[PDB]
Design a protein around this nucleic acid. Structure first.
Ligand SMILES: [Mg+2]
Ligand SMILES: [Mg+2]
Ligand SMILES: [Mg+2]
Ligand SMILES: [Mg+2]
Ligand SMILES: [Mg+2]
Ligand SMILES: [Mg+2]
Ligand SMILES: [Mg+2]
Ligand SMILES: [Mg+2]
Ligand SMILES: [Mg+2]
Ligand SMILES: [Mg+2]
Ligand SMILES: [Mg+2]
Ligand SMILES: [Mg+2]
Ligand SMILES: [Mg+2]
Ligand SMILES: [Mg+2]
Ligand SMILES: [Mg+2]
Ligand SMILES: [Mg+2]
Ligand SMILES: [Mg+2]
Ligand SMILES: [Mg+2]
Ligand SMILES: [Mg+2]
Ligand SMILES: [Mg+2]
Ligand SMILES: [Mg+2]
Ligand SMILES: [Mg+2]
Ligand SMILES: [Mg+2]
Ligand SMILES: [Mg+2]
Ligand SMILES: [Mg+2]
Ligand SMILES: [Mg+2]
Ligand SMILES: [Mg+2]
Ligand SMILES: [Mg+2]
Ligand SMILES: [Mg+2]
Ligand SMILES: [Mg+2]
Ligand SMILES: [Mg+2]
Ligand SMILES: [Mg+2]
Ligand SMILES: [Mg+2]
Ligand SMILES: [Mg+2]
Ligand SMILES: [Mg+2]
Ligand SMILES: [Mg+2]
Ligand SMILES: [Mg+2]
Ligand SMILES: [Mg+2]
Ligand SMILES: [Mg+2]
Ligand SMILES: [Mg+2]
Ligand SMILES: [Mg+2]
Ligand SMILES: [Mg+2]
Ligand SMILES: [Mg+2]
Ligand SMILES: [Mg+2]
Ligand SMILES: [Mg+2]
Ligand SMILES: [Mg+2]
Ligand SMILES: [Mg+2]
Ligand SMILES: [Mg+2]
Ligand SMILES: [Mg+2]
Ligand SMILES: [Mg+2]
Ligand SMILES: [Mg+2]
Lengths: 46, 271, 93
RNA sequence: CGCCGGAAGACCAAGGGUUCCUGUCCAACGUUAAUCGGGGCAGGGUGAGUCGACCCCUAAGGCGAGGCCGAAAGGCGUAGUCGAUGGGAAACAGGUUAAUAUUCCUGUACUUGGUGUUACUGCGAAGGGGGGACGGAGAAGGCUAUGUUGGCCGGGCGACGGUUGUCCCGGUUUAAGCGUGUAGGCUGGUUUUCCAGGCAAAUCCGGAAAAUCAAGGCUGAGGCGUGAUGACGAGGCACUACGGUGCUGAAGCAACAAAUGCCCUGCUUCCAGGAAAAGCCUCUAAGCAUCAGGUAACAUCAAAUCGUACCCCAAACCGACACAGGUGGUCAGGUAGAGAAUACCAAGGCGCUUGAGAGAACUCGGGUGAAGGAACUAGGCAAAAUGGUGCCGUAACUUCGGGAGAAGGCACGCUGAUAUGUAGGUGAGGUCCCUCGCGGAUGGAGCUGAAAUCAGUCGAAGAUACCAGCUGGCUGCAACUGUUUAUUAAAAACACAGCACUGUGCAAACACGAAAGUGGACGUAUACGGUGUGACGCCUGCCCGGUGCCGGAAGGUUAAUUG
RNA sequence: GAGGACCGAACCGACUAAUGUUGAAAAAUUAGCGGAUGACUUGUGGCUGGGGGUGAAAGGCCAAUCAAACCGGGAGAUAG
């Protein structure tokens, strides 16, 4: 059966990539929270 | 002509189609075409603002001359053409100076007829004149409501307007809806009436024929659940309420015109 | 031209392997580890200046570093560029 | 030996990321053992002017200088700028690695730029025009891929009767490019004058009027030649470090069949009327006129960067698994067959990572069954049965189309003859003509080849396997095709064409929006929205007291305000 | 050579039965079944956001999640 995760790196970067997060002020707060928590990987990337 | 298809299929039994052998069998005039992308009834918020719109055949927009402001210069009709963007047919005219334009094809017009706009044009179907130069009682179409703005009234297939009275700077018109309206005399109109009058005789015949025209199905409000529509649910078929729009406004009778700006031009409302 | 200070940095090491050896004795081609950002123009000028030979054409490719596992932790070796430098017929090294 | 073979083979995209190859190891991992592995460890491996990306160009859409709007955050949007799933220059065959190759090598090509010289020369865009540039369906003509047979070449003479022949086995391959402009498709051609159009200008486009010529131009599969005295090539002969390596190398034709591929972005036809922009061609303005710049020839230089291994009905992707699931595109051999169904095979790939015995009940999946034949059961659930082609024949009813494959029946293999292979298809040589060629006419060799009739003949059975409708009668509901509760409901539910009422005069009603605005619609009452009904046929009666809606404006009552 | 035409593979679907039900599988397999030129199907990309979307309407669907998604917070809600 067709499961929910059908990967596509183009759609992955356009939806959750770094520049997508930096576009809006809400996405920038996501990066702020993740930097504060000390995440090793801020966003989806290679 | 109006022809009924033979019932070789349940979907073809009731089809009644309109054939016109004088329509151009070929490609339209390229320099007068534009891209006309569909919308699905969505506005710039991406929300459905008009239900039951979607799909249908791809269509290219024909730039129709509704202003007819090329006065003095005669023009000849090259051919009548099918236009998917409107119910009427359009005529490709060729002016004496070499310009080609698209106009609404009036009734009786055919390839080779000569038309002209301006205050000096002859009174005959296809000519465009300011309404103060048109005899009272005549039948016109493609009427402007502001001078130089472009025709906005009586553009559908078979429609027309008759000038019933003229006084001062205004003329009174009887619209196809039966409403008497005042329009200032400097507005333009085209003599005659819009062609393709038998457009209303067609029968689509099957559900798919409406889908080709970009019309999605209409779900009756009484078939929904109470959360979806005021006509709600009920065990079985229950109505027990006054008919309303999906947003609760009473339909079947309630007048919704609220425009005090243009009331001075309405001589008498339709009835 | 290209500055010699730049040329003295693009060549890193001569790649030694079975394929590199047969390419040397069957097609007169040397295989070199070059700088990651080196272009075919820079590699050609550097070999002709430092090794004093005549270069016909340069083919390059980027080698992806392997993901190795040191004890219990995983690491990844660096990527590096490999160059196939073809010399003229009457040249040696 | 068995299995797949429109896949369980081959190749891309996506996604994964070293799983690829070699050496080595067997703790853990592998549903067992493991010397093996997609496991551990080490080493190796991805070569591009032409493939892809990047790049140029835009679609939906995104963002958006100013701008408009909004308590703030922000919303919308102009100029713009991004955004492929689409448009845009160019390479093929052979060889080679343990692992890459249209990338390396060999041979033979091509494209776009830069610079230079020479010859000729009105160039010039953020503008104009052209072009790019476009639907569905259908038809059948020409082809090719490809296959079959013959010929040719090489080999063979048979473990058991026969097998020097009408015998057996194998091979019979060759590209882009360049030249030729064919089947066929489209279009009159040229010159001169004039002109309210293409925002200005225009020699261009459009329009008008003349004269003249009638064949000119564009497009175009394939064939043919060349590419190629080459390469490849059955095999043979050498070595083998027994995997391979080296050397040599015959024929390399014709006929027929033939695509869902190509001509074809064509032709015909229909209505539901079928992207954009750039590259490209052309036109001039400003401007530049020695120049600059353009066209042509030759020379020379440049074509960067990134991707390139491996897996893809998969043990490597999505499913927690080495999971009977899901996963877009390309390729499409033989015999039978209408066929991409099905059966058996080729190329190629596999036997599905526990076995060994035994041959109880019982369960699962199947086979057969005396006599009976729905007595079973909520119910013919399941099973059995029917099943093909041709011909004959076919009811009520009907909206005249249907119903209908109604029902029912007959024939069906093989051999011979008609006819040493017919009708038909294909078409050589020859001959003739030609305004000469990839020409026309005639001509029929050769090849291919149904269907039918008659006679004979075998079996219990000839649509023999796989494959492949059960049929009829009465009736409810819904007209129909379609849609729906992903994961217990597919229906009489929803939709539907049609009908009616009602709103709506355009800055439309209405909807999304504190707003700007957007949809409705680049539409205009033969239009649009809402509501109910639901093809068609015959029809749709009475009630306006209640509730709602519409109209009315006299009177009564009545808010802020006023005081 | 018309058709939301007919028969029937791919493809899409899911009517019946059996199996399975600590499954091979958190919805499948096997044998039959419906549509199969269209209101068809499919790839890539895009848009619509939670009292909101979308819905040929089942309260269906909106990441194995739905009569109001998920995540964090109010929050140690309150619990005769
Ligand atoms: Mg997304
Ligand atoms: Mg309706
Ligand atoms: Mg319901
Ligand atoms: Mg309600
Ligand atoms: Mg009831
Ligand atoms: Mg090279
Ligand atoms: Mg490279
Ligand atoms: Mg590894
Ligand atoms: Mg391996
Ligand atoms: Mg073990
Ligand atoms: Mg390994
Ligand atoms: Mg701003
Ligand atoms: Mg914006
Ligand atoms: Mg761009
Ligand atoms: Mg390989
Ligand atoms: Mg242009
Ligand atoms: Mg052939
Ligand atoms: Mg023998
Ligand atoms: Mg013998
Ligand atoms: Mg011709
Ligand atoms: Mg590669
Ligand atoms: Mg590869
Ligand atoms: Mg593969
Ligand atoms: Mg496979
Ligand atoms: Mg699997
Ligand atoms: Mg699929
Ligand atoms: Mg098969
Ligand atoms: Mg047994
Ligand atoms: Mg029995
Ligand atoms: Mg019996
Ligand atoms: Mg019986
Ligand atoms: Mg009984
Ligand atoms: Mg009983
Ligand atoms: Mg049954
Ligand atoms: Mg059966
Ligand atoms: Mg007989
Ligand atoms: Mg009853
Ligand atoms: Mg029905
Ligand atoms: Mg149905
Ligand atoms: Mg269900
Ligand atoms: Mg069901
Ligand atoms: Mg009644
Ligand atoms: Mg009132
Ligand atoms: Mg059908
Ligand atoms: Mg079918
Ligand atoms: Mg099945
Ligand atoms: Mg059917
Ligand atoms: Mg309910
Ligand atoms: Mg869910
Ligand atoms: Mg609190
Ligand atoms: Mg608590």
């Amino acid at each position: 059966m067709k499961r929910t995760f059908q990967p596509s790196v183009l759609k992955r970067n356009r939806s959750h990539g770094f520049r997508a997060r930096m576009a809006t002020k809400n996405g920038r707060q996501v990066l702020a929270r993740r930097r504060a928590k000390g995440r090793a990987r801020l966003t989806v990337s290679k | 002509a109006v022809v009924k298809c033979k019932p070789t299929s349940p979907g073809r039994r009731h089809v009644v189609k309109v054939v016109n052998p004088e329509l151009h069998k070929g490609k339209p005039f390229a320099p007068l075409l534009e891209k006309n992308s569909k919308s699905g009834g969505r506005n710039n918020n991406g929300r459905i603002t008009t239900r039951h719109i979607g799909g249908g055949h791809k269509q290219a927009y024909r730039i129709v001359d509704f202003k007819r402001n090329k006065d003095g210069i005669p023009a000849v009709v090259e051919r009548l053409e099918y236009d998917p963007n409107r119910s009427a047919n359009i005529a490709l005219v060729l002016y004496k100076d070499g310009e080609r334009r698209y106009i609404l094809a009036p009734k009786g017009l055919k390839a080779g007829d000569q038309i002209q706009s301006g205050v000096d044009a002859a009174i005959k179907p296809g000519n465009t004149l300011p309404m103060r130069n048109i005899p009272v009682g005549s039948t016109v179409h493609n009427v402007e409501m502001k001078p130089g703005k472009g025709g906005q009234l009586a553009r559908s297939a078979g429609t027309y307007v008759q000038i019933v009275a003229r006084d001062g700077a205004y003329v009174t018109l009887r619209l196809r809806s039966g409403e008497m309206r005042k329009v200032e005399a400097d507005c333009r109109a085209t003599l005659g009436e819009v062609g393709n009058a038998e457009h209303m005789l067609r029968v689509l015949g099957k559900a798919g024929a409406a889908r080709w025209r970009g019309v999605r199905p209409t779900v009756r409000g009484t078939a929904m659940n109470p959360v979806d529509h005021p006509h709600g649910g009920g065990e079985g078929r229950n109505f027990g309420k006054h008919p309303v729009t999906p947003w609760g406004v009473q339909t079947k009778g309630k007048k919704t015109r609220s425009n005090k700006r243009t009331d001075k031009f309405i001589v008498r409302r339709r009835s | 031209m290209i500055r010699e200070e730049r040329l003295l940095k693009v060549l890193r090491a001569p790649h030694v392997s079975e394929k590199a050896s047969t390419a040397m004795e069957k097609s007169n081609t040397i295989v070199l580890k070059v700088a990651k950002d080196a272009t075919k123009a820079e590699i050609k000028a550097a070999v002709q200046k430092l090794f004093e030979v005549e270069v016909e054409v340069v083919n390059t490719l980027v080698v992806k570093g392997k993901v190795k596992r040191h004890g219990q932790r995983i690491g990844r070796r660096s990527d590096w560029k490999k160059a196939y430098v073809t010399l003229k017929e009457g040249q040696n090294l």
